[PDB]
């Protein structure tokens, strides 16, 4: 309960955001450079992300990914 930085593995954040199927799926995707965080692309799953960055999570290439909505 101190002031600092609370980051979590990308794999965990992805699973929670229903971005991936299983832990192995999220981890594999990160290794294949499928998921990126903000202006910085992460390749390792051990990568820690902060609540602030959590919202700045996007897929390297979401061309196929559907979603007619914008915002």
UniProtKB/Swiss-Prot annotation:
GO biological process: maturation of SSU-rRNA; ribosomal small subunit biogenesis; rRNA processing
Tagged with keyword Nucleus: yes
Subcellular location: Nucleus, Nucleolus
Domain of life: Eukaryota
Coiled-coil regions listed in the entry: none
Keywords linked to the UniProt accession: Nucleus, Ribonucleoprotein, Ribosome biogenesis, RNA-binding, rRNA processing, rRNA-binding
Span of domain S4 RNA-binding: 8-65
Assembly information from the UniProt record: Part of the small subunit (SSU) processome, composed of more than 70 proteins and the RNA chaperone small nucleolar RNA (snoRNA) U3. Component of a heterotrimeric complex containing IMP3, IMP4 and MPHOSPH10. Interacts with MPHOSPH10.
Protein's job: Component of the 60-80S U3 small nucleolar ribonucleoprotein (U3 snoRNP). Required for the early cleavages during pre-18S ribosomal RNA processing. Part of the small subunit (SSU) processome, first precursor of the small eukaryotic ribosomal subunit. During the assembly of the SSU processome in the nucleolus, many ribosome biogenesis factors, an RNA chaperone and ribosomal proteins associate with the nascent pre-rRNA and work in concert to generate RNA folding, modifications, rearrangements and cleavage as well as targeted degradation of pre-ribosomal RNA by the RNA exosome.
Similarity field: Belongs to the universal ribosomal protein uS4 family.
Name assigned to this protein: U3 small nucleolar ribonucleoprotein protein IMP3
Organism: Homo sapiens (Human)
Upper lineage: Eukaryota, Metazoa, Chordata, Craniata, Vertebrata
């Amino acid at each position: 309960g101190s002031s600092g930085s609370s980051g979590r593995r990308l794999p965990t954040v992805l699973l929670k955001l229903r971005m991936a199927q299983h832990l192995q799926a999220a981890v594999a995707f990160v290794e294949q450079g499928h998921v990126r965080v903000g202006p910085d692309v992460v390749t390792d799953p051990a990568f820690l992300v902060t609540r602030s960055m959590e919202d700045f999570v996007t897929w390297v290439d979401s061309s196929k990914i559907s979603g007619p909505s914008s915002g």
